[PDB]
Structure 1
């Protein structure tokens, strides 16, 4: 009642004051406290309220401080009944950097989203896949200084976090980055975004082919992905590089 419905009473102006900051600091102690924690983390309304308050530019650092404190100490804060709202919260915080403080906050938040894999290895497919979806989506961000960090962080997530043998590389390619590709029919995204995502999928393919866990149908599938987005600027160079490095990797294992 008081928080969501009475929007006019509690606004941008009120939460920017000292009173709102102390109110939020006292409020998060309930989540810290043992009484209402199991109740509060499950509810939709509370996380909807934090989704609202993350839009407040003054309060973004406070919410990020709370989340960073909470996730590190206890890995059990996240569960299947509350993960997607938290992921949306970090998505909003990372996308807040539209315009240094916001840039630094996004810089920390991207790594934080990348860091939610070691804390709990017991993960569902849809559970893990949203993190990769958010990281892939965050490459769309027009500001160069954030997307250039986002792509390398997503590469650092793919390189040494996910164990293949209870998923597979096929769905990691299909259900993850490829939704960006099929959803990029708008020309405003332009060749820069598709070239960047092509580069990183080439890099991770190179790594896991060096290690070696693939089959014929993999290579056929990324071949189909390449032909689905034909463009004389990028397809020719990437195809030549790929058909050279596949034989280099084949040379790797035999001797």
Structure 2
């Protein structure tokens, strides 16, 4: 009897299509629809609605409800939604907890703006103007009364703001009432209603988290509704945020997360574009994913996936997000230090190398830097990529520290760390290169154990470190600085580890062989003679 929900049961079939008038006096919008006008001309319907929602509000029994009653409540709520009466923003707290903002309002049909609020009668006739059908001001009066009656009712608090009506039946019927077809009749509120239903059902699930089966069902429904076609981009974005939230709330849904990562994040494209991950919302999405890296259940899968790390490499190439990725990585390494599993090393080291390779923009600034310094002039705003340069330095420091706190390496990761430090040592940036050589020297002299069963021969250390780098010196003029740094590090490491006694003169023999490989140009030869004098000095010193 609420004259809003009905069933399929004059000479013109015209159902009076929906039109909206927004006026100009203040900011007040009035929808005019067939359901709206029928509600405006039915006092009995107004009484029925107010009493029905009062009864729903007071009813302190979840079990005494029926399935048909739940369906009727949902249908009334949805009908008020589609008539532009019920405010779509039902749960502002959930939107603020995430970083979404003001669910897409169900758009009206063909709309007419009424600048003047007054009566009609003999006016605006025989002088062009007009033309639209438009409400006859009685429909306008009725629609105003309809909005007033609905606001006098407290639908939002009556149904959801009860804390006892929110049981599995409500979420189930809300999901089952969703629409999966874009009919021409309901084209104006398809995506909006999808988002509204998803958000409201997720909020109601938040109110009752200790229902595992309901969680699985709601996740399945959300995924099925998301994989549909003909959805605008913003709908896909919001549903992505909702999907990651639901995955976080549940306990063991590894397959769904795999589907999310692979299908949505890696393959979509042109949707998860550059700007999407910098909109205050992509940051929330990424923070949710990284927090999901720390959980009782979603740990082992998120470690050994290689598609998670492929996506991490994709998002760490983005200029703005690099600092956030580095902060997450650094916190994970410092706090528990268990993110580095037995097989995770190459991926995380790749992420570190990517965040340390900002020497591109470093030398981009350095171009004009050297252009103005080679002249007798002055530059004040220095290192426009100062954030990027400091990030690269912190990444190299993170690698240096990463060579520690494990103590059970396989020497493959040792070679990898040394190679990564060298590869950054090739970098154009002067500060980056200097930090790389300094930290590589420090790590080599006081961070790798010499007489360990893992690696008990410094020859292999040198030959998996500097030797592989110098074997690829085919960069023409760029080889001179790289070789000078390589040999300088070699000499320093050789001296430092000789000063601590030790044995295996094959170390000396191999270093001599490397020097012979670079014996040309005689500058390396004089360096060899100098370190030979240093060798004699160390001989005397260790003797006495």
- For normalisation by structure 1, the TM-score amounts to 0.96
Q: Is the 8 A contact 1:125 1:167 kept in 2?
A: no
Deviations 1:74-96 (A, max 9, x none): 12210222111000000010002
Of 182-191 and 67-76, more deviation after overlay is shown by 182-191
Q: Is the 8 A contact 2:359 2:428 kept in 1?
A: no
Cα distance in 1 for partners of 2:523, 2:273 equals 48
Cα distance in 2 for partners of 1:214, 1:89 equals 38
Q: Is the 8 A contact 1:80 1:127 kept in 2?
A: no
Cα distance in 2 for partners of 1:247, 1:38 equals 54
State the shift of 1:233 in Å. Answer: 5.0
State the shift of 1:104 in Å. Answer: 0.3
Deviations 1:186-227 (A, max 9, x none): 214231110111111100111001012232211111111011
Deviations 1:15-68 (A, max 9, x none): 111110111011111101222011111111000000111100100000000001
Of 75-84 and 86-95, more deviation after overlay is shown by 75-84
- Which of 525, 528, 539 is the matching residue for 1:236? 525
Gaps of 5+ in 2: 1-262, 362-385
RCO higher in structure (CA 8 A, sep ≥6)? 1
Cα distance in 1 for partners of 2:428, 2:475 equals 15
Q: Is the 8 A contact 1:96 1:102 kept in 2?
A: yes
Cα distance in 1 for partners of 2:525, 2:465 equals 24
- For normalisation by structure 2, the TM-score amounts to 0.46
Cα distance in 2 for partners of 1:125, 1:187 equals 31
State the shift of 1:128 in Å. Answer: 1.8
Cα distance in 2 for partners of 1:27, 1:254 equals 59
Gaps of 5+ in 1: none
Cα distance in 2 for partners of 1:177, 1:111 equals 19
Cα distance in 1 for partners of 2:297, 2:266 equals 23
Alpha-carbon RMSD across the aligned residues, in angstroms, is: 1.2
Of 223-232 and 43-52, more deviation after overlay is shown by 223-232
Number of aligned residue pairs: give it.
Answer: 255
State the shift of 1:236 in Å. Answer: 2.9
Describe the SS at the equivalent of 2:319: coil
State the shift of 1:127 in Å. Answer: 1.9
Deviating runs (4+, > 3 A) in structure 1?
none
Q: Is the 8 A contact 2:345 2:413 kept in 1?
A: yes
Q: Is the 8 A contact 1:195 1:234 kept in 2?
A: no
